[PDB]
From a paper:
At the TGN, the Arf1-5 GTPases are activated by the BIG1/2 proteins in humans and the Arf1/2 GTPases are activated by Sec7 in the model organism Saccharomyces cerevisiae. The TGN-localized Arf-GEFs comprise roughly 1800 functional residues including a central catalytic domain of ~200 residues mediating nucleotide exchange. Conserved domains C-terminal to the GEF domain, termed HDS1-4 (homology downstream of Sec7), act to integrate the signals from several small GTPases, including Arf1 itself, to switch Sec7 from a strongly autoinhibited to a strongly autoactivated form. The N-terminal DCB (dimerization and cyclophilin binding) and HUS (homology upstream of Sec7) domains, though conserved in all Golgi Arf-GEFs and essential for Golgi function, remain more of an enigma.
Here, we present the crystal structure of the regulatory DCB and HUS domains from Thielavia terrestris Sec7 and demonstrate that they form a single continuous structural domain. Following correction of the annotated intron, a construct comprising residues 1–458 of T. terrestris produced crystals diffracting to 2.6 Å. Using experimental phase determination by single-wavelength anomalous diffraction of selenomethionine-substituted protein, the structure of the DCB and HUS domains was determined with four copies in the asymmetric unit. The best resolved chains in the model lack only unresolved loops and the final ~35 conserved residues of the HUS domain absent from the crystallized construct. The DCB and HUS domains together form a single continuous armadillo repeat joined by a conserved ~1400 Å2 hydrophobic interface, comprising helices 7 and 8 from the DCB domain and helices 10 and 11 from the HUS domain. We therefore regard the N-terminal regulatory region of Sec7 as a single DCB/HUS structural domain. In the T. terrestris DCB/HUS domain structure, residues 245–271 of this interdomain region (between helices 8 and 10, including helix 9) are resolved in their packing against the armadillo repeat, and the remaining 46 and 21 residue stretches are unresolved in the structure. The crystallized construct forms a dimer in the crystal via its C-terminal helices 14 and 15, with helix 15 of each copy aligned antiparallel to each other. Dimerization is known to occur in N-terminal constructs of Sec7 and its homologs, and small-angle X-ray scattering (SAXS) analysis confirmed that the observed dimerization mode occurred in solution as well as in the crystal. As such, it appears unlikely that the intact DCB/HUS construct (1–492) is prone to the same artifactual dimerization issues at its C-terminus as is the truncated Sec7(1–458) construct.
Numbering used by the authors:
A (entry chain A): 4 to 38, 42 to 198, 245 to 271, 293 to 326, 331 to 458
B (entry chain D): 7 to 13, 25 to 36, 43 to 82, 96 to 192, 244 to 270, 294 to 324, 331 to 457
Write the structure that this text describes.
């Protein structure tokens, strides 16, 4: 649009002692006058301006970059054999990297931190573009890192909110894809053991799944529907696995510290995703491909190791907030996964919860919370 | 005493012999009981029971007197007054001020009163039988408590079906035991042990009676319920006897001491295994109470079995959607007792 032009006017005006910057800006403004151009000619002064680390070069640049990514201006590398050379230089991973690189720890200016959270949000969660792979997971991790590392309470909060919206969206998109999948299956029919053992029980191989490039979808053949479904589901699995892993750290006797805040946001996000999208987890149509043999595997069976690991490490915590969030996760597992998790449920009941009830010096509130979970299970299915 | 004998040939022969030797008095009394009428049988039983309450019949002579008493019961067609008198005379025989009978003699009396309770048609008779039965077994265990009390002073993978084949203590051909009477460590050991074999035999008998596989007022269910009730009463009222590490019973094979709890383990677990998951709420609730006692006092000794019961019976129940809500809530209440203990 023209926000591109206002951005370049501000950048060229505020360039100051940086001649190269002014020159790239003006070169871009000139190139626009033929009404747009080569993505790189517009992207060069934006990128450079983000590297000054001052206001308003950096904030204006970040704003422009996020909006340009959301308008599908930038694209990802392709492996189509029908490309003729005329295609633009793919720049989306680089645009997202440029945004992410502006956060360099707690000394980064608070206005810039905020602008980074908003630009990643605009890049990742918009109405025209779906980003998959490394770019998405980088945006998500960067918003988390700002939540964890900023010394601004305000920024910690907007980051928490934005992170929640992002992980929520990744799973909502998967839920939509499964809904479509089941509609297609229906249409198709119409026409006619200890606690210590659980840390070493990983049936699903997920080596190098975090790897792989950024892809982009805009908003016909079953092979293609299956591959898209795989993209969506893989985003989901990587997000979920990430939070289980963050939840598994062991702490000694802390609530405003980074370790405890990390454990809490991880457990909270795991619980929220389970509660709001339990059908994504339990559907026998939800399938992700193993890395070793490329054989399709049930989603629940694939995340099982990480879920049980999160509970193994955090159940029986002496911190009541952590104990409570595990109780709720365990409730979901007890209610919607009795069959798939039968043995694990048995271990958690014997070695963590009943063990706690039998313990004489154990906090009474915790005991009552657990027993309350049992009563809730009696009065539901 | 003489009045009883005054109230055909043997009778007067006894009176003549008084001018006394036990057999001459025991002969007409025994014969009189076989009449099956009032007031012959009632008076004879009355007298025999009183004599056993005394030490006239003694340390086998007590067993024959008790046999004669027990033989007066031939089922529900037996006259009600005779039933009641039998219950009272057996009470007087087991619970008196001077004499404690051990072994078969004890075990014969207790089984008989139980049977009267099971077979009588008199609500009154079955109830008084129940009360006396409870008092008998309670008294046996109380006696053991006293003996242990003296003794410390003087000293100073695994499943529900495997539990049916896990018997570490062998009591094959342990038998009822010989009849003995109570009013130098070896004599003391013989005595402490005397009490302990009595207790073990009672408890085993009741677990066994509880072990049958199957309305609510019929004989099988009333048998099951009274066995479970008594088992629970013994655990609840005399737990220290079960938990005491000095309370020891000698194996039948090699006479090597074994802890009492470890000895009754098989039978207690069998009782829970067979009755734990019953669809009938009374049985379910009583088993729950027993399981509670096992949970509170035998966590160390019974860890694996408790784990088996939790996984295969109670949690299983909690997981079933079509399961009765009342049972689930009874179990969860047990767990909550575990919270606020």
């Amino acid at each position: 649009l023209k926000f591109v032009v206002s951005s370049l006017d501000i950048i060229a005006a505020q360039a100051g002692r940086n001649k190269q910057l002014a020159e790239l800006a003006e070169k871009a403004l000139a190139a626009i006058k033929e009404n747009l151009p080569d993505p790189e000619v517009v992207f060069a002064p934006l990128q450079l301006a983000t590297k000054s680390g001052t206001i308003p070069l950096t904030t204006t640049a970040l704003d422009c970059i996020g909006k340009l990514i959301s308008y599908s201006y930038f694209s990802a590398p392709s492996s189509s054999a029908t490309q003729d050379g005329t295609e633009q230089t793919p720049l989306i991973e680089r645009a997202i990297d440029t945004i992410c690189d502006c956060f360099q720890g707690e000394t980064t200016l608070v206005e810039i931190q905020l602008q980074i959270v908003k630009s990643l949000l605009a890049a990742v969660l918009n109405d025209k573009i779906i980003v998959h792979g490394a770019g998405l997971l980088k945006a998500v991790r960067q918003v988390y890192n700002i939540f964890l590392l900023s010394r601004s309470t305000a920024n910690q909060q907007v980051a928490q909110g934005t992170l929640t919206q992002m992980v929520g969206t990744v799973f909502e998109r998967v839920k939509t894809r499964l809904h479509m999948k089941e509609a297609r299956a229906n249409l198709g029919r119409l026409k006619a053991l200890t606690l210590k053992d659980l840390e070493h029980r990983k049936s699903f191989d997920d080596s190098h799944m975090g790897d792989g490039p950024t892809m982009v979808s805009q908003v016909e053949t079953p092979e293609s529907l299956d591959a898209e479904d795989e993209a969506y589901i893989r985003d989901a699995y990587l997000v979920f696995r990430s939070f289980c892993n963050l939840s598994t750290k062991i702490l000694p006797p802390d609530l405003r510290g980074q370790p405890m805040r990390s454990k809490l946001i991880s457990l909270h996000l795991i619980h929220t995703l389970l509660n709001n999208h339990i059908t994504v987890f339990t559907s026998p149509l939800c399938t992700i491909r193993n890395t070793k043999n490329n054989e399709p595997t049930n989603f629940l069976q694939a995340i099982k190791y990480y879920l049980c690991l999160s509970i193994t490490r955090n159940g029986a915590s002496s911190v009541d907030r952590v104990f409570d969030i595990c109780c709720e996760i365990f409730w979901l597992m007890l209610k919607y996964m009795r069959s798939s998790f039968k043995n694990e449920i048995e271990v958690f009941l014997n070695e963590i919860y009943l063990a706690l009830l039998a313990r004489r010096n154990a906090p009474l509130s915790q005991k009552l919370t657990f027993v309350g979970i049992l009563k809730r299970l009696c009065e539901d299915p």
